[PDB]
């Protein structure tokens, strides 16, 4: 866990992009490479294309998902089994 004293981490990149999107009231698919920004209530309804390293995965943000770093929801390695 990031300590409280620092406050939650969101890179300025998608902070700016998501602000522009929800001020114009338009909900788009935003293309992000940042796995490391935690989710804020500002992000609550939007959709994200996050990088899994091979591609961009669709992620619909909901209420239950706040408190979590984004790339949690785009898995990385593919395991089908043997």
């Amino acid at each position: 866990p990031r300590s409280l004293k620092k406050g939650p981490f969101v890179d300025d990149h998608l902070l700016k992009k998501v602000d522009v999107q929800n001020e114009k009231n338009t909900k788009q698919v935003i293309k992000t490479w940042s796995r490391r920004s935690t989710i804020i209530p500002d992000f609550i309804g939007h959709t994200f294309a996050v990088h899994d390293g091979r591609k961009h995965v669709p992620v619909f943000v909901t209420e239950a998902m706040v408190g979590h770093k984004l790339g949690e929801f785009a898995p990385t390695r593919t395991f089908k089994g043997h």
């Binding site: 409280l4 406050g7 939650p8 804020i40 209530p41 609550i44 209420e63 239950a64 998902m65 706040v66 408190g67």
Partner: peptide
Amino acid sequence: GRVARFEKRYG
């Protein structure tokens, strides 16, 4: 209510 749990921490 996960967002309230969020705001208690940081706010």
